[PDB]
Write an enzyme that holds these catalytic residues in place. Structure first.
Site, PDB file in Angstrom:
ATOM      1  N   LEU A  27      19.716  18.389  26.575  1.00 24.92           N
ATOM      2  CA  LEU A  27      21.169  18.317  26.768  1.00 24.92           C
ATOM      3  C   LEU A  27      21.628  19.464  27.653  1.00 24.92           C
ATOM      4  CD1 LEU A  27      22.371  17.350  23.132  1.00 24.92           C
ATOM      5  CD2 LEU A  27      22.110  15.811  25.098  1.00 24.92           C
ATOM      6  N   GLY A  28      20.840  20.527  27.679  1.00 27.99           N
ATOM      7  CA  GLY A  28      21.140  21.711  28.461  1.00 27.99           C
ATOM      8  C   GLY A  28      20.172  22.825  28.177  1.00 27.99           C
ATOM      9  N   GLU A  29      20.065  23.753  29.117  1.00 26.88           N
ATOM     10  CA  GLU A  29      19.143  24.871  29.027  1.00 26.88           C
ATOM     11  C   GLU A  29      19.762  26.129  29.592  1.00 26.88           C
ATOM     12  OE1 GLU A  29      14.647  22.789  29.295  1.00 26.88           O
ATOM     13  OE2 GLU A  29      15.331  24.071  30.952  1.00 26.88           O
ATOM     14  N   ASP A  83      31.301  33.113  27.665  1.00 29.35           N
ATOM     15  CA  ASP A  83      30.595  32.068  28.417  1.00 29.35           C
ATOM     16  C   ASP A  83      31.470  30.828  28.524  1.00 29.35           C
ATOM     17  OD1 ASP A  83      28.425  31.002  29.857  1.00 29.35           O
ATOM     18  OD2 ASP A  83      27.369  30.263  28.089  1.00 29.35           O
ATOM     19  N   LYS A 118      19.654  23.257  18.848  1.00 29.41           N
ATOM     20  CA  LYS A 118      19.497  24.420  19.718  1.00 29.41           C
ATOM     21  C   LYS A 118      18.360  25.289  19.210  1.00 29.41           C
ATOM     22  CE  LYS A 118      21.902  28.024  22.166  1.00 29.41           C
ATOM     23  NZ  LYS A 118      23.229  28.553  22.553  1.00 29.41           N
ATOM     24  N   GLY A 164      17.328  29.896  25.749  1.00 30.73           N
ATOM     25  CA  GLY A 164      17.656  28.829  24.811  1.00 30.73           C
ATOM     26  C   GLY A 164      17.742  27.460  25.438  1.00 30.73           C
ATOM     27  N   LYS A 165      17.619  26.422  24.608  1.00 30.39           N
ATOM     28  CA  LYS A 165      17.747  25.039  25.043  1.00 30.39           C
ATOM     29  C   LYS A 165      18.410  24.218  23.967  1.00 30.39           C
ATOM     30  CE  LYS A 165      13.199  22.992  23.821  1.00 30.39           C
ATOM     31  NZ  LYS A 165      12.207  24.092  23.666  1.00 30.39           N
ATOM     32  N   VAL A 166      19.125  23.174  24.373  1.00 30.16           N
ATOM     33  CA  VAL A 166      19.787  22.269  23.449  1.00 30.16           C
ATOM     34  C   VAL A 166      19.192  20.886  23.732  1.00 30.16           C
ATOM     35  CG1 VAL A 166      21.959  21.296  22.545  1.00 30.16           C
ATOM     36  CG2 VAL A 166      21.923  23.689  23.361  1.00 30.16           C
TER      37      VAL A 166
END
Ligand SMILES: CCCS(=O)(=O)N[C@H]1C[C@@H](N(C)c2ncnc3[nH]ccc23)C1
Length: 281
Positions: free
Chosen positions: A15-17, A130, A42, A21-23
């Site tokens: 879903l995102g990085e 963020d 996450k 971290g990564k989701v």
């Protein structure tokens, strides 16, 4: 209820990085029949486990309509944060696909929701650090939620700011002068990032009109080292992101109040909520 078994979290896609971290989208399927609920997971990229534990503690402590819902944790020595999954994804994914369906009235309602979520986060004495469209999730065409807290910090007790000791790879093109020049993050620094996010929202997250692309056309490329210095100088000169096409004067004036050089001269989130609501009829 709040404990998810790793073996039952069936990986679907990313879903995102971030950097560390990564989701990922997973289906929590303990029955093994693929009827389980889809969740956002996450984790840590291939430590930093202390920072994910802090993020978990922050999100578990936040309960608001405009903040992504904490669901639980998954343990490995390691830990994963479990959140509700919003299939429409971030505004960065959603807005370019729905340009014709989302008008100014809807964009202004998203701006109120993000400000409500941010004002709630500030009342808990946290700075997000963020705030960008990639972190604003679409629950529906009528609702958005702040969906990542990876850089969120508790404001130092009896102080107005948090001092970053790391800031390895941070979103500098969304950052206020005091964050870029002194590594000090105020609630007012999030107000500045909000103004940048509002700019992204008004351009429908068009990649060619993104804060990075615009500033890389204003300043010019240098990469890594001198970027921050050249950004600070551009901001010192009084240069700001231009008024998006079809953005009315009243909306740009609010956006410009997010971008006062001095933190003490910036508008508050409560003033932004009232300002946008006065434009909604
Ligand atoms: C460390 C990576 C930060 S990031 O990649 O810049 N943003 C996050 C990915 C996530 N996101 C698109 C999500 N999409 C859908 N449902 C969701 N629930 C919870 C989150 C989430 C926000």
């Amino acid at each position: 209820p709040t404990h998810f078994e790793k073996r039952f979290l069936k990986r679907i896609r990313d879903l995102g990085e971030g950097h560390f971290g990564k989701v990922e989208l997973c289906r929590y399927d303990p029955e093994g029949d693929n009827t389980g609920e889809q969740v956002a997971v996450k984790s840590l990229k291939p430590n930093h486990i202390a920072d994910l534990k802090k993020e978990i503690e922050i999100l578990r402590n936040l309960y608001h309509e405009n903040i992504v819902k904490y669901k639980g944790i998954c343990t490995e020595n390691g830990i994963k944060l479990i959140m509700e999954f919003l299939p429409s994804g971030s505004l960065k994914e959603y807005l370019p696909k729905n340009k014709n369906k989302i008008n100014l009235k809807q964009q202004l309602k998203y701006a109120v929701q993000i400000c409500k979520g941010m004002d709630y986060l500030g009342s808990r004495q946290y700075v997000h650090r963020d705030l960008a469209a990639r972190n604003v999730l679409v629950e529906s065409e009528h609702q958005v939620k702040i969906g990542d807290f990876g850089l969120t910090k508790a404001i130092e007790t009896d102080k107005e700011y948090y001092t970053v000791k790391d800031d390895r790879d941070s979103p500098v093109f969304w950052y206020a002068p005091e964050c870029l020049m002194q590594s000090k993050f105020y609630i007012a620094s999030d107000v500045w990032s909000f103004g940048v996010t509002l700019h992204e929202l008004l351009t429908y997250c068009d990649s060619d009109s993104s804060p990075m692309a615009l500033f890389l056309k204003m300043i010019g490329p240098t990469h890594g080292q001198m970027t921050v210095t050249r950004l600070v100088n551009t901001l010192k000169e009084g240069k700001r992101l231009p008024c998006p096409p079809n953005c009315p004067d009243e909306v740009y004036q609010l956006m410009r109040k997010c971008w006062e050089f001095q933190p003490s001269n910036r508008t508050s989130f409560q003033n932004l909520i009232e300002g946008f609501e006065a434009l909604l009829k």
